[PDB]
């Protein structure tokens, strides 16, 4: 019973700077705490979903920019999308293995390969950006008289 009721509803919070500052401090603690500590295999799934959601937003956005671009660049973009999907597959596979091997000699190795897959995903995202940028600049070259 380290449990207490939510704060009173009898007070307007809309300019309550104490409330806001307590919120800021509790969040700063949560953020420090979760960074210091290694997250349990439970938590892996929600984190990976967040990354998958972010990827899908990106792929959907990249789908809508491809029409605009010179057809000579489409294969490169699509390949770079391919590579992100490839990194997501790997990430999910290593996450599943890390959970599977949770209390074995393989726990930390699988965790590591999961992080390397995630890192690869971020690196490949920035490469997609650069591929799209070169495309757009090429397109501007073409567009200008």
The number of beta carbons lying within 10 Å of the beta carbon of residue 114 is 23
What is the CB-side half-sphere exposure of residue 139 using CA atoms within 13 A? 16
Instruction: Give 6's DSSP letter.
Output: P
Structure tokens at 100: 């599977």
Place of tokens 């491809």: 66
Burial class (CB in 10 A: 0-12, 13-18, 19+), 84: buried
Angle at 59 between CA 56 and CA 62, to 5 degrees: 150
* DSSP annotation string for 61-127: HHHHHGGGS-GGGHHHHHHHHHHHHHHHHHHHHHHHHHHHTTTSTTHHHHHHHHHHHHHHHHHHHHH
Experimental approach was X-ray
Consecutive H or E run containing 140: helix 107-143
Q: State the Cα–Cα distance between residues 71 and 101, nearest whole angstrom.
A: 46
User: In terms of Cα–Cα distance, which of 38, 52, 64 is closest to 91?
Assistant: 52
Q: State the Cα–Cα distance between residues 127 and 125, nearest whole angstrom.
A: 5
Resolution (A): 2.2
Using only the alpha carbons of the chain, give its radius of gyration.
22
Q: State the Cα–Cα distance between residues 87 and 53, nearest whole angstrom.
A: 14
């Amino acid at each position: 019973q380290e449990i207490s009721p939510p704060p009173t509803a009898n007070l307007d919070r809309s300019n309550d700077k104490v409330y806001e500052n307590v919120t800021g401090l509790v969040k700063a603690v949560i953020e420090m705490s979760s960074k210091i500590q290694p997250a349990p295999p439970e938590e892996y799934v929600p984190m990976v979903k967040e990354v998958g959601l972010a990827l899908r937003t990106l792929l959907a956005t990249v789908d809508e920019t491809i029409p605009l671009l010179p057809a000579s660049t489409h294969r490169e973009i699509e390949m770079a999308q391919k590579l992100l999907n490839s990194d997501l597959g790997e990430l999910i596979n290593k996450m599943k293995l890390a959970q599977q091997y949770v209390m074995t000699s393989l726990q930390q190795e699988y965790k590591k390969q999961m992080l390397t897959a995630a890192h690869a995903l971020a690196v490949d995202a920035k490469n997609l950006l650069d591929v799209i940028d070169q495309a757009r600049l090429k397109m501007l070259g073409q567009t200008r008289p």
